[PDB]
From a paper:
Mutations in leucine-rich repeat kinase 2 ([name]) are one of the most common drivers of the familial form of Parkinson’s disease (PD) (1–3) and are also associated with increased risk for the sporadic form of PD. [name] is a large, 2527-residue multidomain protein. We present cryo-EM structures of LRRK2RCKW, WT, and carrying the PD-linked mutations G2019S and I2020T, bound to the [name]-specific type I inhibitor MLi-2 or the broad-spectrum type II inhibitor [name]-824.
As with MLi-2, the three structures—WT, G2019S, and I2020T—were very similar. In all three cases, the G-loop was folded over the inhibitor to interact with its pyrazolopyridine and Y2018 from the DYG motif. Here, however, the cryo-EM map for LRRK2RCKW(G2019S):[name]-824 could accommodate two rotamers for H1998, while WT showed density for a single rotamer. H1998 is parallel to F1890 in the WT structure, where it adopts the “up” rotamer (H). In this case, the cryo-EM map of LRRK2RCKW(G2019S):[name]-824 showed density indicative of two rotamers for H1998, only one of which would contribute to inhibitor binding, while we only saw the latter in the cryo-EM map of the WT complex.
Residue numbers in the entry: 1624 to 1632, 1649 to 1720, 1727 to 1798, 1805 to 2020, 2036 to 2046, 2050 to 2074, 2092 to 2160, 2165 to 2207, ...
Write the structure that this text describes.
Amino acid sequence: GIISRRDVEYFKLLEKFQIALPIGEEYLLVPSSLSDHRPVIELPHCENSEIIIRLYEMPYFPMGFWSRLINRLLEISPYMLLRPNRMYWRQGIYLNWSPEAYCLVGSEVLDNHPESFLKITVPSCRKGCILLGQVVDHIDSLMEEWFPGLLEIETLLKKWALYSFNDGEEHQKILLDDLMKKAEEGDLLVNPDQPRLTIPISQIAPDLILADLPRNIMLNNDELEFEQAPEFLLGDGSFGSVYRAAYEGEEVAVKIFNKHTSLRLLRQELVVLCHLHHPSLISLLAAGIRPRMLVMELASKGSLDRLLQQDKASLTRTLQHRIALHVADGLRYLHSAMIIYRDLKPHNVLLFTLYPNAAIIAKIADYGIPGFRAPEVARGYNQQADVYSFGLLLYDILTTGGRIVLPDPVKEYGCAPWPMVEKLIKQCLKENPQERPTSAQVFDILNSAELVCLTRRILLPKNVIVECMVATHHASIWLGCGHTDRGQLSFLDLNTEGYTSEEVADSRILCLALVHLESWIVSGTQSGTLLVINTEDGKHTLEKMTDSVTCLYCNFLLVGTADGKLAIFEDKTVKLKGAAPLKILNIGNVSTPLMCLSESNVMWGGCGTKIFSFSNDFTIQKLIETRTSQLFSYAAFSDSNIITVVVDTALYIAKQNSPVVEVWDKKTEKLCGLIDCVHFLREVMSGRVKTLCLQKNTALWIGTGGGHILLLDLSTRRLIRVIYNFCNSVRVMMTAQLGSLKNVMLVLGYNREIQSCLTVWDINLPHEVQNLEKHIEVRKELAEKMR
Ligand SMILES: Cc1ccc(C(=O)Nc2ccc(CN3CCN(C)CC3)c(C(F)(F)F)c2)cc1C#Cc1cnc2[nH]ncc2c1
């Protein structure tokens, strides 16, 4: 019946309907028209004491039983804890690795017995015990799943173990139920007529004592301090018969299979557990038969369902993200092994620590022992149903309480916004299973520090573009717009998203500043008018500048004009109409606009291609011509006007249309280094620098014209991260306060008719990137170590 693949070559359907059943080496089984007889098999051993014989007496073989059985047994291996010499018949299969590892499963007929028999013969060794365990597990699973009713009341199905007291005698039979009772009564089978003739109950039925367990899984009863009492019940009724106990000095959870059809459920759960080695799944420590027992690791902090209602204060954003990441990792692990977690809910998620930075926080458990079902599950599993269950779990994690005690999580429960988690919840809850992401995709989405550190994403009205923005030093943003010839001043409320606007100037508003005394906002427009508007009262003008006001800084107020001039006002001066600046001075010329200013005190500034510096005297101290960096940079980049200067210990200079950020020494006035943004972007796959912002906690934020954010570590200037997929062009970037001591970075980006957006990032984004990468590496190392 064996047919080569090339002689037949769809195949998945052939496997489904028991047509192909691939063997290996491009060979198909095709049970139909096989040898139909026993092809003379001589076993390595022929004595009673060297073999184990297990008999299944049945009234008949069900149709399709042997084909499915052989398909199941084709994958057996004693090393799954050499290539076998496989042989096939229609009703049987023979495997042979070695004289110490073989398995003969085949049909059998007794004299004067109409009933059919299935005989399993293995060597009397550990490998033979493992093979026997696998074979009987496969047979029992097959009968449970494909042929129910042959098991219930029995149904003339009997299981026998064949034994003898002396080599050379004929095998006697004992039912597995009677032998199971004797196994609890003792460890020996006794000849009723001659007590002197004794055999071990094991090694004729070694699967009844779990002798095929891995060496590290066998119970050491000398190390187990376990008492079965309701005082030690775990979850005062939950989790079923789960008890607290001590094993090898550590507190563990103990599941009891007593008072039921034990050694079938226990063996099934062992078959499931022993091949699952994953950091996100609860780990099996031991198993036993004296009481039918599973000993697993104990979760110190209980389950997630109890935490979501009792200790809501502990659910920080980092802890929630780590719990979600661990659960998604566990689901990916289960789905990669073709294993389905049917019912996932907060009750099934165990917590080991509440420390957000721990390597292991959450694990998935399925104890013994509704509204957490996919529509196709509720109406009627599938991996998409598990993805839907994970979406529900992530919704429950995101919301404070709610369902555990769908509508929009933020409006209904308060639930401070988590923009990139709500999108994942929406994707995971799609009704059509084929549109839902896979568990690997879900984990890949959650494995992103952009997901953690993205706090808000506010979208402005269409075709309204914003030239400048300034935040009140107190979640209120003033915007100077330029989508018109008459400049407009807008106000955006970042707590309750709300946009208002008003036209205040004849020309576009190029820059904004806040003067705090009373508080006022100075708008510098293209015509040069400095329009000072009260921040509490509605809509003064200061002395008009000779050209466009290109920068405003605010102590004093500094007005850098496009004419290369710097005007200096006192805070009390700007309060009155038409007041002249305290000073005016020339650093550049008509063609060299004063385009940036910064503080570090000493006031640095960038005008044309020059870095100028000044102290309280308002006189120029240092003039550094950056043009010379053409010797190290490219000429067209170093000849461009400086658009922003950032100073902490060295000057960081960005130039117009230039993808290179220059680093200059404050003391020697010499070029310290160059940062090539195109080089960094090519590692991920424009580069022109538009914004340049500094985080004092060791980070440089570079906004590019292609909508990317380069996070650099200003120590050897290594690349921390590249953030993207949020806009098409970064236009403004600045640090701000949203209240409640929340430090944020506001990125005004563009989605180009034109859709401009304001994105809020947590100030600890580089630290979160590094921490998440280290966490993922540690978890990967753990998964590799577990095998
Ligand atoms: C004592 C105990 C025994 C067993 C388990 C267990 O989960 N077993 C288990 C079984 C199956 C599966 C996977 N199957 C595959 C297909 N199936 C259809 C679906 C899933 C999983 C896997 F994990 F792989 F999904 C785990 C947990 C505990 C426990 C405990 C404990 C520990 N500490 C605690 N503290 N408070 C309470 C508490 C409770």
